[PDB]
Design a protein around this ligand. Structure first.
Ligand SMILES: COc1cccc(CC(=O)Nc2ccc(O)c(-c3cc(C(=O)O)ccn3)c2)c1
Ligand SMILES: [Mn+2]
Ligand SMILES: [Zn+2]
Length: 351
C-alpha cells in the first residue's frame, strides 16, 4: 500500500495551485500520500502569484551577530569541518566579501561542473557563512507557508512549557556565499525541516532515504571510530562531509537536487541531508512536526557529549496522541518498530 508509493525513494517536486497552497499541514500530508517522505527531502515550488516580501532592497544594515569561517580538513571524499567565529558583520559587508574576486563563484556551464569544483576546492580559501541568524524576512501579513508560524503540532512545546528553542520553533536566516556548506545531519529530535530560499544563487542538496539512514551511520562510524566512541550521535555535531563518490563507492543510495531562489525544501524525519551554496544568497528555515514524527521523536538518539544540545520532552506528545501507549512507554516496554514508508495519519483523506 505505502511500499508501492515512490519505490525508488527519489526526490519529488510539487507545483501546488493557490487553493492547495493555502493550507500548510494538509499539503504536507498530501505530498506524504504521494510517497515524497521516502526520499527524505522534497521540493515545493510555490505559485507565481506568491511572494513573502515585496522587496529585499532594504536589508543591508541587518546584523549577522556571529559569522562563521568554515575550515575544512581531509582528503578523497572524507572531510571534517571546523568553525572559526568571526566578529559581527552586516549584510552589506557580507555581500561585498561574497562578491569579491577572492570569494566569488567560479565560471561554469552545467551544475555537474560546479559540483566537481566544490569537491576539489572544499579545503582551500575558507569562506564565511552567515548562519543561525535569528529573524524572518516574511511580511507580517502573509498567511501562506509562513515559516514563523506554521501552526503544526510542534507548537505544543511552547504552548505547554513556554520554551522557545531558537531555529527549531523560531526562524533562522542563513546568508551563504560560494562553497559554504552544511554537513550531513538529520534535524534536532529528528523533526521535519522547511527551507525557503529568499534570493540569490542556488543551493544544492544531497539526501539519503530514511529507510537507509542506518547504512550512512554505519559507514560514518567506520570512518571516524574515535568520534563514534566519544559520542552516541556525532553526526549531530554537523562537522562531517562525505562526497557523493564516497557514498556511491559504499552503496549508500542518495539523491541530489538544486534549490533555486523562490523555492521551498522540506526534509522529513530521519532524513540525512547535506549540501553547499552556489554564491551569495539568503535562506530561511525552521523545524516542524506531524503526528508521524512523534514516534521518531521517542526514538531519536541524541548527542551525549555536549550539554548545550537540543532535547524536547516527548511526554506531552505521548499523552495527547498515544494515550494507550503511555504507561508502556514510560515503563520502557514500548517496542514499536518504525516503518519509514507509511505516510502520516493526516494523509487519510487522500488515500
Ligand atoms: C558544532 O557545530 C554546530 C553547533 C551548533 C550549531 C551549528 C550550526 C548548524 O549547522 N545548524 C543547523 C542545524 C540543523 C540544520 O538543519 C541546519 C541546516 C542548514 C542548512 C543550510 O546551511 O542552509 C540546510 C539544512 N539544515 C543547520 C553547528
Ligand atoms: Mn537540516
Ligand atoms: Zn556529541
Amino acid at each position: 500500500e505505502s511500499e508501492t508509493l515512490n519505490p525508488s525513494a527519489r526526490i519529488m517536486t510539487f507545483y501546488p495551485t493557490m487553493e492547495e497552497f493555502r493550507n500548510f499541514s494538509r499539503y504536507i500530508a498530501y505530498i506524504e500520500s504521494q510517497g515524497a517522505h521516502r526520499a527524505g527531502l522534497a521540493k515545493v515550488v510555490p505559485p507565481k502569484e506568491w511572494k513573502p516580501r515585496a522587496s529585499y532592497d532594504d536589508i543591508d544594515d541587518l546584523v549577522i551577530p556571529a559569522p562563521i569561517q568554515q575550515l575544512v580538513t581531509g582528503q578523497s571524499g572524507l572531510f571534517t569541518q571546523y568553525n572559526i567565529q568571526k566578529k559581527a558583520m552586516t549584510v552589506r559587508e557580507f555581500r561585498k566579501i561574497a562578491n569579491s574576486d577572492k570569494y566569488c563563484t567560479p565560471r561554469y556551464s552545467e551544475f555537474e561542473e560546479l559540483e566537481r569544483k566544490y569537491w576539489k576546492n572544499l579545503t582551500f580559501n575558507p569562506p564565511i557563512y552567515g548562519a543561525d541568524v535569528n529573524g524572518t524576512l516574511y511580511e507580517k501579513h502573509v498567511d501562506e507557508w509562513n515559516i514563523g508560524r506554521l501552526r503544526t503540532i510542534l507548537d505544543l512545546v511552547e504552548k505547554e512549557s513556554g520554551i522557545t528553542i531558537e531555529g527549531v520553533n523560531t526562524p533562522y536566516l542563513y546568508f551563504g556565499m560560494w562553497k559554504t556548506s552544511f554537513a550531513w545531519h538529520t534535524e534536532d529530535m529528528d523533526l521535519y525541516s522547511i527551507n525557503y530560499l529568499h534570493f540569490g544563487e542556488p543551493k544544492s542538496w544531497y539526501s539519503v532515504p530514511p529507510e537507509h539512514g542506518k547504512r550512512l551511520e554505519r559507514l560514518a562510524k567506520g570512518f571516524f571510530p574515535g568520534s563514534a566512541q566519544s559520542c552516541e550521535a556525532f553526526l549531530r555535531h554537523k562537522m562531517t562531509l562525505i562526497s557523493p563518490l564516497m557514498l556511491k563507492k559504499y552503496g549508500i543510495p542518495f539523491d541530489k537536487v538544486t534549490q533555486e531562489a523562490g523555492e521551498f525544501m522540506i526534509t522529513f524525519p530521519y532524513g540525512y541531508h547535506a549540501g553547499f551554496n552556489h554564491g551569495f544568497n539568503c535562506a530561511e528555515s525552521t523545524n516542524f512536526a506531524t503526528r508521524r514524527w512523534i514516534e521518531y521523536g521517542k526514538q531519536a538518539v541524541l548527542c551525549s557529549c555536549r550539554k548545550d544540545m537540543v532535547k524536547i520532552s516527548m511526554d506531552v506528545f505521548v499523552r495527547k496522541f498515544q494515550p494507550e501507549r503511555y504507561k508502556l512507554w514510560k515503563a520502557g516496554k514500548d517496542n514499536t518498530v518504525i516503518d519509514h514508508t507509511l505516510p502520516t495519519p493526516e494523509a487519510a483523506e487522500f488515500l
